[PDB]
DNA sequence: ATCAATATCCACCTGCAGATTCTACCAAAAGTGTATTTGGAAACTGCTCCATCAAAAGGCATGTTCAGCTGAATTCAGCTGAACATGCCTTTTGATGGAGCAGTTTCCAAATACACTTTTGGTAGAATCTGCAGGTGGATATTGAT
DNA sequence: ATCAATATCCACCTGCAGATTCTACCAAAAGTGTATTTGGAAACTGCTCCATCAAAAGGCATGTTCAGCTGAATTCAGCTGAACATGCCTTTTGATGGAGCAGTTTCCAAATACACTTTTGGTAGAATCTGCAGGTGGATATTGAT
């Protein structure tokens, strides 16, 4: 049986839009949508290591691999998302 | 089949792309576009149905198949 | 207690995880925090479009997100526009016609 | 009786079509041409119904965005009228030839 | 006579020069001063390897010069044979270099 | 050291023309040589960018022929001839 | 018993073994190589080294020269409908094809 | 010391088989470097996507041999199928 | 522009059905706790190779002039492609029952990964070999004036 | 036409920058032998896929009529190419110092690999409810025309 983001996706949508709901259709877009940058950014993340003879990849090849793929404000406000949930995981 | 592909139907086409004025010679010309993107698209899908042993394309075969020609869609797992 | 949840994040780290175990290389050691780096990553951007989107549902005056929002929201973001050139199927395209056209 | 003047109803139907979202190609010559066309890559092959919309989808995205840049090639003709001449030189810069 | 060859007739020999040498057109040093400059205004105190300036040039090159292939051919559409920015903007939305 | 100024206009008028001449363009109007110089800096910030940041991740303080080549491919302008 | 590379063993000119190896670094994860994927892979590369150096080396003989250079690899490539399709690389040292469009020509 | 590994050695064989009269410039060779491992490349990178879509843990022969009708366009691609299917099944009776 | 009459479009409500959301428990994974394992950090260090400098010379950039011909107006009519009201055929759609065949299983051979102990094939500089870059000079065009 | 006036060839010529071959350890490919999966191979089981039938309702195809667009032609201001004079600043030949890359080690922190114990996320019915698509009737936009 088929693992989806949807679960993950719905729960997004209540906390920027408690009003919202979402249709199918359009639920099986944000899947293809998180599914593909899920890809890009794996992707670059490993060629990253490989190309520094590495075989971990750690938190940098992700910071690196989004500031690669994403385009300006969006890869500042996602990088502030990215420390700020890491460090908070390892203070608890 | 190709022919199948109407006139009517192109015009509406060319209608959402902003198009005004239509040629009497772009029917034919388009046919012909399309019949080589879908040629490329569905090769690639049944090359990848085959691999799978199936008899089956299904839509992932084809989210593949255009994720390979860049051109890439969003809605059918992927 | 969910990594997710010590995270603070309501995607699946630990399915994450394990999805990005299964992809590089044949030695690929995934570090802990790269899950969830990632899982923060997937889960900001998804806000950012989803906030956009419901937007252009509000002004079209209506409760649920159709693919059209989606596709309303990120063509009609320079940033989100230049990331994703995909196709949106149902999504239609951004209505607009040339000046020259127009019937004066 | 009445009568619109030519470019008039046109533009009625660029409005129209660019509001809505449906698929703007018949639904069964379409899947007619699908099957007809993998039928020299392979025989006897079943699609899924999501596939044949999958493509139809991708196909018509496709032809949209070309139509675009033909009007495009055209304008810059100092024409208002699409020719084949447009897709062709569209299709060019794009490396599709 | 003094002798004048027609507009145009240069032109021609210089296509025929050009399509037929393969060497860089742009000049060695002002290019990469130009990429120093670009670099500096990104990360204060780089170096480059010889090898990775050249790399950039070729690319740049490349770049125009198929570029202006397709602006050319946004000229001659056009019914010209002069190019204009015009035509350099066209090319450019058409490949989805700016859309 | 010095200061690095005004280096788009290292890219000559000259210059200009020859690589239009390769691009097989026989008449060029006077604008040409600034809106072409503009392509090119969106061009070359776009690549050295990228390079940089290869440079950055790997913690070198050279940006390599290396991380060039890949900053192209990234790019969909491949290079071949300085792989190494 | 006595060495026999595996290239010897498939009739190949490429290194079977030092491909087998830069499989491995690859992919998946608990990702296994076949014996055989070497093989092939060697024998395709093979093959496309040979279309390539076959078109680039009539071409330096239209030069009247022995050695192949980047430009000859252009004119190789270029010429050939299948490999400009498959190679849309940049040739270092290439050059472009010459051609003049006709409405530029004298008339 | 230190020795970065490459195919000129293979390359250099391969063009004395086709042209034995014709020798390559060094930067020549270097292309013919970027060729064969570009291709390489998008073979195993073609070949691993495979092998994820259809739940298989490894890479044979006859994903090798799907990666290439994908990437090979029309006639290159049927002449590298007998290539490989020749050398392939050359190597196993061998 | 008002004065007409078409026809289009736009808002405001309206009623069910087709989808959405909310509800109910069984496993495949996500979360622990233990015991190795390993990679990529830190620390010296040898040593390419990058930044800088000097210097002289000539290949090119620059700026001017001067006028040829190109682009941009403008006018014209032939005729293509839009609008349309007409006529019917092919798409749509909706059960229906039959079945091909994807997708789970439950096994054993074939194929593959390990883990050591020789055994070459390749690589990095040495040592030799030589195509061809870049210089000359008259055939042979190619242009453009008269 | 047919000469000028220059540009383009195409050949022959020679030492050196750059190839092709010559050696010398070392990493890695190849030989075993043993341990472990894998992805096949039959056998079923549901589930969506194709193939009917059989209508009304669109939506397509067809022929007229003509507005208005494209293309052809004509003219001309002035932009941009060609040529020339001038001299700067790129190129190319060396050397030097030292930054910093890359090759070795030594090894804790961080990752994997079990082996269990719990938990959640996926299904499949249950329970609302959004908005499609359909009225009216009220300005709008369009086109003929005092």
Known sequence: ?92 | ?78 | ?104 | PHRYRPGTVALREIRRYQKSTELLIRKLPFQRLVREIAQDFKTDLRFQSSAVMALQEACEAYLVGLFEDTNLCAIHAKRVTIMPKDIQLARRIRGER
């Not at chain 1, 199918?24 to 290591?49: H, P, Q, T, W, Y």
């Open chain 3, 1 to 104: 207690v969910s990594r997710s949840q010590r995270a603070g994040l309501q995607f699946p780290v630990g399915r994450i995880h394990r999805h990005l175990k299964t992809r590089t290389t044949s030695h690929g050691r995934v570090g802990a925090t790269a899950a969830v780096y990632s899982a923060a990553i997937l889960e900001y951007l998804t806000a950012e479009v989803l906030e956009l989107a419901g937007n252009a549902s509000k002004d079209l005056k209506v409760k649920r997100i159709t693919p059209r929002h989606l596709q309303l929201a990120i063509r009609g973001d320079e940033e989100l526009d230049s990331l994703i050139k995909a196709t949106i199927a149902g999504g239609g395209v951004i209505p607009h016609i040339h000046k020259s056209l127009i019937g004066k």
């Open chain 2, 1 to 78: 089949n190709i022919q199948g592909i109407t006139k009517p139907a192109i015009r509406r086409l060319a209608r959402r792309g902003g198009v005004k004025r239509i040629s009497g010679l772009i029917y034919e010309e388009t046919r012909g576009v399309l019949k080589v993107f879908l040629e490329n698209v569905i090769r690639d899908a049944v090359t990848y149905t085959e691999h799978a042993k199936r008899k089956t394309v299904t839509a992932m075969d084809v989210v593949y198949a255009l994720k390979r020609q860049g051109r890439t869609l969003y809605g059918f797992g992927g």
């Open chain 1, 1 to 92: 049986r088929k693992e989806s983001y949807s679960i993950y996706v719905y729960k997004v949508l209540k906390q920027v839009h408690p009003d919202t709901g979402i249709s199918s259709k359009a639920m099986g877009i944000m899947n293809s949508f998180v599914n593909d940058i899920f890809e890009r950014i794996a992707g670059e993340a490993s060629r990253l290591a490989h190309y520094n003879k590495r075989s971990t990849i750690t938190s940098r090849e992700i910071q690196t691999a989004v500031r690669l793929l994403l385009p300006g404000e969006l890869a500042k406000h996602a990088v502030s998302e990215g420390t700020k949930a890491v460090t908070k995981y390892t203070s608890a």
